Amino acid sequence: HPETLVKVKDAEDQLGARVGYIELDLNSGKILESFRPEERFPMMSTFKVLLCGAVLSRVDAGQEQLGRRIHYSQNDLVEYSPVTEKHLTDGMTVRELCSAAITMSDNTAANLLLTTIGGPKELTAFLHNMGDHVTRLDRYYGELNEAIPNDERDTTMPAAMATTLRKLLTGELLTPASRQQLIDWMEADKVAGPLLRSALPAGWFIADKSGAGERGSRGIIAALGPDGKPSRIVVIYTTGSQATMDERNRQIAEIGASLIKHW
């Protein structure tokens, strides 16, 4: 994808930052194009799809129920909890929490779900067991941040994330009902408008999950395709930029425009 590669390198120039990129054939798993595929990037909230995949594996095993209600308190609430802050007395069901984590990127929802699966170390072990020996989650939201140079915690690599997302969405790990639920949550993503969705023509399918973080981090993982059916996985990460969120958004959208134009 010569033009898209040019645009990815342009984005590094514009942002003064690293950009990692991969296009993966959804059906075959073949890497169609990549840039920095085996470099680490902060996952940010894109991990929340993997989290809910682990939750769904427990549901499939009969060890979790999507309808199970979890109660929590003010003390559980961390920064950016737009859905969970509304239900301190209601509690929320496991499916409501995964909906909040994926579609709104609610951080308390993610923490609560992490607890159900045994925490970050257990998510990492889940990933390792499905053949992703790179992606790692280490911390809950709200934990003390060390500010470590080239911090390896809570990171993935574009190729690993793309491969892992394909396994979760189409592989045999989850039941088809659970695969469908996971992609349905991603399709209902509410907070990724200015990224790939902004470049998406009418009639296209997209299921995605966005991320942002300090130090200029911004990213998106997606399954998308024309005619209302996904056919490709796209993963885009950037970190290190001093640019505003708008500027990072625009570069990702422009990579998206290139992806679409040269589909």
DSSP 56-102: HHHHHTTS--TT-EE---GGG--S--TTGGG-TTT-EEHHHHHHHHH
Q: In this structure, what token pair is assigned to residue 229? A: 């059916």
Helix (H) or strand (E) holding 258: helix 245-261
Which class for 125: exposed (0-12), middle (13-18), buried (19 or more C-beta within 10 A)? middle
- Residue 194 CA to residue 178 CA, distance in Å, equals 28
DSSP SS3 for 204: coil
What is the CA 171 to chain-centroid distance, rounded? 17
Tell me, in Å, the resolution of the deposited structure: 1.4
Q: In this structure, what token pair is assigned to residue 176? A: 């088809």
Q: In this structure, what token pair is assigned to residue 263? A: 């589909």
Helix orientation angle between 94-103 and 176-187, rounded to the nearest 10 degrees: 50
The catalytically annotated residue of 38, 85, 143, 214 is 143
Q: In this structure, what token pair is assigned to residue 119? A: 């925490």
Provide the sign of the torsion angle of the four alpha carbons 146, 105, 174, 94, taken in this order: positive
Active site residue 146: no
Active site residue 143: yes
Tell which residue, 160, 141, 143, 130, has the closest CA to residue 100. Answer: 141
Which class for 198: exposed (0-12), middle (13-18), buried (19 or more C-beta within 10 A)? middle
Binding residue numbers: 209-211
- Residue 140 CA to residue 33 CA, distance in Å, equals 33
Q: How many helices (H) and strands (E) does the chain have?
A: 8, 9
Asked whether the beta carbons of 178 and 13 are under 8 A apart, the reply is no
- Residue 102 CA to residue 208 CA, distance in Å, equals 9
CATH number of the domain within which 120 lies: 3.40.710.10
Tell which residue, 91, 58, 54, 97, has the closest CA to residue 72. Answer: 91
The catalytically annotated residue of 23, 34, 45, 96 is 45
Q: How many CA atoms lie within 13 Å of 163's alpha carbon, on the beta-carbon side? A: 18
Asked whether the beta carbons of 85 and 111 are under 8 A apart, the reply is no
Q: In this structure, what token pair is assigned to residue 131? A: 């053949």
Asked whether the beta carbons of 255 and 8 are under 8 A apart, the reply is yes
β-sheet bridge partners, residue 239: 18
Can you give the residue range of the structural domain that contains 239?
Answer: 1-263
For tokens 């990933």, the residue is: 127
Q: What's the number of domains the chain is made of?
A: 1
Q: How far is CA 217 from CA 30, 98, 179, 245, in A?
A: 27, 23, 28, 9
DSSP SS3 for 34: strand
Binding residue numbers for substrate: 209-211
DSSP SS3 for 125: helix
